Subunit: 137 residues, 3 copies
Amino acid sequence: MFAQLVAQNVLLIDGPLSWYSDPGLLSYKEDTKELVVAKAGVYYVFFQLELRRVVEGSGSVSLALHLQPLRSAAGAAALALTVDLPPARNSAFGFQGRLLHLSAGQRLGVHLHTEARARHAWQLTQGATVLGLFRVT
Amino acid sequence: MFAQLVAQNVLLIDGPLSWYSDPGLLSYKEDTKELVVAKAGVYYVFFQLELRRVVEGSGSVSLALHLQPLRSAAGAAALALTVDLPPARNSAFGFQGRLLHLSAGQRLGVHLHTEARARHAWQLTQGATVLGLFRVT
Amino acid sequence: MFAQLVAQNVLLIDGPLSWYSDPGLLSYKEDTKELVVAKAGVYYVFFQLELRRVVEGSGSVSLALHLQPLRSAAGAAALALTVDLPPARNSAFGFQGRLLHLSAGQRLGVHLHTEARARHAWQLTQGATVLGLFRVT
């Protein structure tokens, strides 16, 4: 039991990422942009983000994995990655992984936020933003 | 067979980290600040460190995983992470993982060192320093 | 089914890395500098690169994992890591992992490229460049 998805998005538009199964290799829902877990268990979950400067912009970008229905109003992220974008090093890269208890039926969604002096200046390297997981149980 | 711990420490005081089991989810010893492995085997082991600037400080911070009783006077680290702190990007982040042969009964300890022009200026983001592992055997 | 290799190379010479089994712990071929996979399956594959400034140089360094016989003229990398080297932070570090479908008999090779204003100025920290993997199947 495992999965790996690649993000379609290259432009830095805030909100949830759209995914597609990895060509290289539970299921995805294109309508809500939500991965859904079938088997309950402890999963190793990782994601990865590359950025390329395509110009003189700066700031930071954030990925956050949110689990299904929130189950609290607090809205905590199960996984979160921050990457700073230098002003004029034309690339930036983040990797993070950890163990997660996931429930049978639990939807997963990934959100991108960018607080930058130029959201136009950088963009995601196409094919280089990946969410992967496998069951340790 | 797996585990994941979160560091209590936010202040940058040198010496061994204090841990607690992840709320999200072999055993820990609070007295010596040492995780202890029950089953022998090859484990994937990872740790993760986030830092936040809370001011104009700089330098670097280091995490090192040391295995149990040293078994040599050399004192080599099984796992080690270095993160540089820029002077006035208000955050810094390190992730590292690798495969380790671990012995039944082996204690694990994690040490933090900081060589900085202001140890007061940065601190660990609370909940964001994690040590995790699972058996590949 | 797993493996972990450490790179012999410390100097920043372009081309394929030479490896050796991890002292800490399918097979390696010293003649072609190629790891070879025995059992078919989905593997979690990771690599790691540390760099140390040993002087006033700058630029970037790249690792790329290429799979066996190319099977296309395109020559895409299954795994790729980029690390920028600041001019006068005396260290740099990259980690990346993802899930890969690997074929029985498939050779793996890792290539290092450096585009730098001084390839002489930085070098790989000895023992700190690692390629590891384990089967998720």
